[PDB]
Design an enzyme around this catalytic site. Structure first.
Site, PDB file in Angstrom:
ATOM      1  N   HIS A 119      -1.178  -7.748  -3.716  1.00  0.00           N
ATOM      2  CA  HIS A 119      -1.163  -6.429  -3.093  1.00  0.00           C
ATOM      3  C   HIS A 119      -2.558  -5.822  -3.009  1.00  0.00           C
ATOM      4  O   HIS A 119      -2.757  -4.882  -2.243  1.00  0.00           O
ATOM      5  CB  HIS A 119      -0.210  -5.475  -3.840  1.00  0.00           C
ATOM      6  CG  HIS A 119      -0.771  -4.905  -5.115  1.00  0.00           C
ATOM      7  ND1 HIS A 119      -0.501  -3.619  -5.538  1.00  0.00           N
ATOM      8  CD2 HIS A 119      -1.570  -5.448  -6.065  1.00  0.00           C
ATOM      9  CE1 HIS A 119      -1.110  -3.395  -6.690  1.00  0.00           C
ATOM     10  NE2 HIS A 119      -1.772  -4.486  -7.030  1.00  0.00           N
ATOM     11  N   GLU A 170       6.160  -7.432  -6.791  1.00  0.00           N
ATOM     12  CA  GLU A 170       5.347  -6.499  -6.013  1.00  0.00           C
ATOM     13  C   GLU A 170       6.217  -5.397  -5.431  1.00  0.00           C
ATOM     14  O   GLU A 170       7.433  -5.540  -5.288  1.00  0.00           O
ATOM     15  CB  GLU A 170       4.576  -7.186  -4.860  1.00  0.00           C
ATOM     16  CG  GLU A 170       3.516  -8.198  -5.337  1.00  0.00           C
ATOM     17  CD  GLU A 170       2.159  -7.549  -5.697  1.00  0.00           C
ATOM     18  OE1 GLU A 170       2.148  -6.349  -6.084  1.00  0.00           O
ATOM     19  OE2 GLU A 170       1.120  -8.257  -5.664  1.00  0.00           O
ATOM     20  N   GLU A 218       0.028  -1.509   0.198  1.00  0.00           N
ATOM     21  CA  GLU A 218       1.330  -2.056  -0.143  1.00  0.00           C
ATOM     22  C   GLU A 218       2.035  -2.517   1.134  1.00  0.00           C
ATOM     23  O   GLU A 218       1.716  -2.076   2.236  1.00  0.00           O
ATOM     24  CB  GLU A 218       2.167  -1.027  -0.899  1.00  0.00           C
ATOM     25  CG  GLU A 218       1.561  -0.608  -2.252  1.00  0.00           C
ATOM     26  CD  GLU A 218       1.343  -1.786  -3.211  1.00  0.00           C
ATOM     27  OE1 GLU A 218       2.238  -2.670  -3.301  1.00  0.00           O
ATOM     28  OE2 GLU A 218       0.294  -1.809  -3.902  1.00  0.00           O
TER      29      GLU A 218
HETATM   30  C1  LIG Z   1      -5.731  -6.925  -7.616  1.00  0.00           C
HETATM   31  C2  LIG Z   1      -6.920  -6.257  -8.243  1.00  0.00           C
HETATM   32  C3  LIG Z   1      -7.030  -4.942  -8.387  1.00  0.00           C
HETATM   33  C4  LIG Z   1      -6.110  -3.903  -7.813  1.00  0.00           C
HETATM   34  C5  LIG Z   1      -5.469  -2.913  -8.771  1.00  0.00           C
HETATM   35  C6  LIG Z   1      -4.247  -3.206  -9.387  1.00  0.00           C
HETATM   36  O1  LIG Z   1      -3.660  -4.418  -9.199  1.00  0.00           O
HETATM   37  C7  LIG Z   1      -3.608  -2.291 -10.230  1.00  0.00           C
HETATM   38  C8  LIG Z   1      -2.299  -2.641 -10.890  1.00  0.00           C
HETATM   39  C9  LIG Z   1      -4.215  -1.072 -10.434  1.00  0.00           C
HETATM   40  C10 LIG Z   1      -5.405  -0.751  -9.823  1.00  0.00           C
HETATM   41  C11 LIG Z   1      -6.039  -1.664  -8.986  1.00  0.00           C
HETATM   42  O2  LIG Z   1      -7.209  -1.377  -8.377  1.00  0.00           O
HETATM   43  C12 LIG Z   1      -5.793   0.603 -10.232  1.00  0.00           C
HETATM   44  O3  LIG Z   1      -6.770   1.265  -9.994  1.00  0.00           O
HETATM   45  O4  LIG Z   1      -4.800   1.101 -11.006  1.00  0.00           O
HETATM   46  C13 LIG Z   1      -3.790   0.097 -11.258  1.00  0.00           C
HETATM   47  C14 LIG Z   1      -7.999  -7.185  -8.717  1.00  0.00           C
HETATM   48  C15 LIG Z   1      -9.187  -6.439  -9.284  1.00  0.00           C
HETATM   49  C16 LIG Z   1     -10.229  -7.409  -9.732  1.00  0.00           C
HETATM   50  C17 LIG Z   1     -10.667  -7.622 -10.965  1.00  0.00           C
HETATM   51  C18 LIG Z   1     -10.459  -6.665 -12.097  1.00  0.00           C
HETATM   52  C19 LIG Z   1     -11.426  -8.877 -11.299  1.00  0.00           C
HETATM   53  C20 LIG Z   1     -12.861  -8.670 -11.760  1.00  0.00           C
HETATM   54  C21 LIG Z   1     -13.616  -9.964 -12.037  1.00  0.00           C
HETATM   55  O5  LIG Z   1     -14.220 -10.499 -11.080  1.00  0.00           O
HETATM   56  O6  LIG Z   1     -13.585 -10.441 -13.206  1.00  0.00           O
END
Ligand SMILES: C/C(=C\Cc1c(O)c(C)c2c(c1O)C(=O)OC2)CC/C=C(\C)CCC(=O)O
Ligand SMILES: C/C(=C\Cc1c(O)c(C)c2c(c1O)C(=O)OC2)CC/C=C(\C)CCC(=O)O
Ligand SMILES: Nc1ncnc2c1ncn2[C@@H]1O[C@H](CSCC[C@H](N)C(=O)O)[C@@H](O)[C@H]1O
Ligand SMILES: Nc1ncnc2c1ncn2[C@@H]1O[C@H](CSCC[C@H](N)C(=O)O)[C@@H](O)[C@H]1O
Lengths: 395, 395
Positions: free
Chosen positions: B303, B332, B359
């Site tokens: 997502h 999801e 989404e």
């Molecule tokens: C699907 C991703 C973020 C997308 C997301 C969420 O899946 C959820 C549940 C939340 C937020 C969000 O941004 C948020 O802000 O609140 C909850 C991947 C983000 C990448 C890394 C942390 C990897 C870093 C590295 O390279 O090691």
């Protein structure tokens, strides 16, 4: 309190709301928020506080840039679908629908069968004064709140000593000048502020409404044109929305209505042949020039000033008061610290975030009025209304 | 809907909540918010949205800097007065009481006779993962939402074309790099993010709970160690909170549990001799290395990616799937665009504000899975839970 008991309290307030009891609408709202708080798990509190609400504020702010609430107001019961609204607002259809759907989920507009519809709320937010209120709050007030954690960590978690120049406002906006000086230097926010003053508590019972302050018995009864032909002076009354409401409620008026504010406020008042007040420039930090009027009224004025300045604002009325005749009517929040309520803590933190000031308790106000040379006669309140009405007189 | 009818709907949901029906807690909360929206005048909506909530977010953020919720948790039923709490937190007593009183008015903590008391909510917010969630949201997410009006005005009100580098996140934080790259470059927020993933939907029914996905009938029934000794791979499972919950619910496990994430996530998992999973580094943009497992699970992973990247994430599982045996379990949000709900628009705007992503609807997901080489078997949902569970298989 368990959810079970709050459900019962909520049902009891709904009966009082159906019977049209005073303050029952606000009480019903308060029980609903307590109910939510008693049912929500911490992850839902996090999502609502840190996702839903910042997103909601941002979209509402964006709405005032693309005329969204006005378009939905014009569509009336027909509504508009996303394609029509995206075309009118000049927005990507996909982007618009995602933002609009959050407004639907936050109960600001409604949706049926892919058609978006205005509501009483969104139709109200379409008015120019609410449009400018939204811009002021998101562009000016919001950054100041965002600066609270880092500002108070940096200042040692101290109450702003000077208030005027040493508060979170100055840090958020990266200036060393006071909030009033910042407004004068930053169009269009000063005139946005002046529109905002007619919106921030609109739709709430006024001090002069039935069952609140007895205007007729205290002011009109005993009015004496041989003392002065002035019935009421509104000191710091903005563009005149409060004093105009007074005049429309107590017409024919036995004496004059005088509005006093800053020149930039007076000069922004739109012309109106039906105006029942005289708009005049006055500085609350000089002696009151209108002598021996029947009433001097202030609403949300000294609450924005520290103790020394608040005393001066009230003392500057004293040379104009006719003993035994002139009433001082202070329309301000009186904080009950054993019973904290949103309407009082809201304004308190707004004062901290803009003026570095605070709302005051009854003992606080009595101390200020006494130092000014005034004494309290009576304090009037109304269920669900944030402000009280303190009637004072020459000590 | 009039307030009268919403009061009735609210009473009906309270009966379902007392009878412990699924989703009735969330429904009762939703009716309460609808009730508030049907009673509030626009000035109260302005005050709540633009004063109460930004102030609330700021104070909650400030609380994590002075250990406030932890102190109130330790005081248990005795509580602490303002003087005691100000002394413990190192705050001006006057400043502390004003901030604390707003928490009382927002129903986060309680107060009686000048003593402040922790609540189930505030005691929950005292936990380290919620503390770091609060810091992440206020320091990272909040500025991105604040940038929405000006960012979309500047970009012509277009959906971010690249998503990764051309979104409101980049503008708010004044960088041209993606959100994942920003986290790696900005300690401590990457590890705050990893703690946050165990909090953002905590306390909600999981996909594997009773009445949601039939884990026993679909996965454990027919498990075949001669095909593979691996029962479930959690692809992108963070520090392992979801896979650990799975293991504790379906022990003794017939096969292995494999957690896959980034090295910096795996390396931050605290040691635990009772751990029931193997923590392993894997890149979701390379081919799945664990071959022929009984289930591959992803939760809130594709997502956050545009269509091309989401297709690659799902396609990279395909070479590892055993035909007729391996399940793909995609946990999801499935957006119903005719029925917008906070839990779906929340996450949608969070995706926009961080990843420039979105989404997806059921038709959206089916298109992505089909392009990846997968086909949907069934979609499972649960009342009040944001996410669905899409079971897919080799097309
Ligand atoms: C699907 C991703 C973020 C997308 C997301 C969420 O899946 C959820 C549940 C939340 C937020 C969000 O941004 C948020 O802000 O609140 C909850 C991947 C983000 C990448 C890394 C942390 C990897 C870093 C590295 O390279 O090691
Ligand atoms: C008491 C003052 C502000 C204090 C205040 C309020 O009284 C109210 C009701 C609100 C806010 C506020 O800051 C606010 O932000 O929302 C509502 C005086 C502010 C000075 C000027 C505009 C004069 C400028 C010139 O010199 O001409
Ligand atoms: N030095 C000064 N002299 C006169 N008015 C002043 C002033 N400083 C601030 N004000 C005025 O005080 C008001 C405070 S905001 C309250 C406005 C109005 N009474 C209401 O409640 O809706 C503003 O209108 C502002 O212009
Ligand atoms: N290229 C990549 N390879 C492996 N994992 C990745 C990745 N990019 C992002 N992720 C991981 O995807 C997860 C998205 S957040 C979701 C975490 C967890 N599944 C939960 O729902 O609670 C993070 O743990 C992040 O580290």
């Amino acid at each position: 309190a368990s959810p079970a008991s709050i459900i019962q309290e909520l049902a009891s307030a709904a009966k009082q709301y159906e019977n049209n009891e005073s303050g029952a609408r606000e009480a019903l709202i308060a029980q609903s928020r307590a109910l939510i708080a008693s049912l929500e798990v911490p992850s839902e509190f996090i999502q609502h506080t840190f996702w839903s609400q910042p997103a909601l504020s941002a979209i509402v702010r964006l709405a005032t840039d693309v005329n969204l609430f006005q378009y939905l107001k014009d569509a009336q019961e027909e509504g508009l679908n996303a394609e029509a609204l995206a075309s009118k607002t000049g927005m990507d259809v996909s982007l618009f629908a995602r933002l609009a759907r959050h407004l639907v989920a936050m109960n600001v507009i409604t949706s049926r069968n892919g058609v978006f519809y205005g509501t009483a709320l969104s139709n109200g937010l379409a008015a120019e004064n609410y449009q400018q209120s939204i811009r002021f709050c998101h562009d000016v007030s919001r950054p100041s709140f965002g600066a609270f954690p880092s500002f108070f960590k940096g200042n040692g978690y101290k109450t702003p000593a000077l208030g005027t120049t040493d508060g979170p406002f100055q840090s958020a906006h990266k200036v060393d000048i006071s909030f009033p000086q910042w407004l004068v230097g930053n169009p269009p926010y000063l005139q946005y502020f002046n529109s905002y003053m007619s919106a921030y508590r609109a739709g709430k019972p006024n001090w002069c409404d039935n069952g609140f302050y007895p205007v007729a018995d205290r002011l009109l009864n005993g009015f004496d044109a041989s003392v002065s032909d002035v019935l009421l002076v509104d000191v710091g009354g903005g563009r005149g929305h409060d004093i105009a409401t007074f005049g429309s409620q107590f017409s024919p008026l036995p004496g004059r209505l005088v509005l006093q504010d800053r020149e930039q406020v007076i000069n922004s008042i739109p012309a109106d042949e039906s105006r029942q007040f005289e708009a005049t420039t006055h500085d609350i930090f000089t002696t009151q020039p209108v002598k021996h009027a029947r009433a001097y009224y202030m609403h949300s004025v000294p609450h924005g000033f520290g103790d020394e300045d608040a005393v001066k604002i009230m003392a500057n009325l004293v040379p104009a008061l006719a003993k035994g005749y002139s009433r001082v009517l202070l329309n301000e929040i009186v904080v009950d610290e054993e019973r904290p309520v949103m309407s009082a803590t809201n304004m308190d933190l707004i004062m901290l975030a803009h003026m570095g000031a605070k709302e005051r308790t009854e003992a606080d106000w009595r101390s200020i009025l006494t130092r000014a040379g005034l004494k309290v006669v009576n304090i009037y309140s109304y269920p669900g209304v944030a402000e009280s009405l303190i009637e004072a007189e020459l000590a």
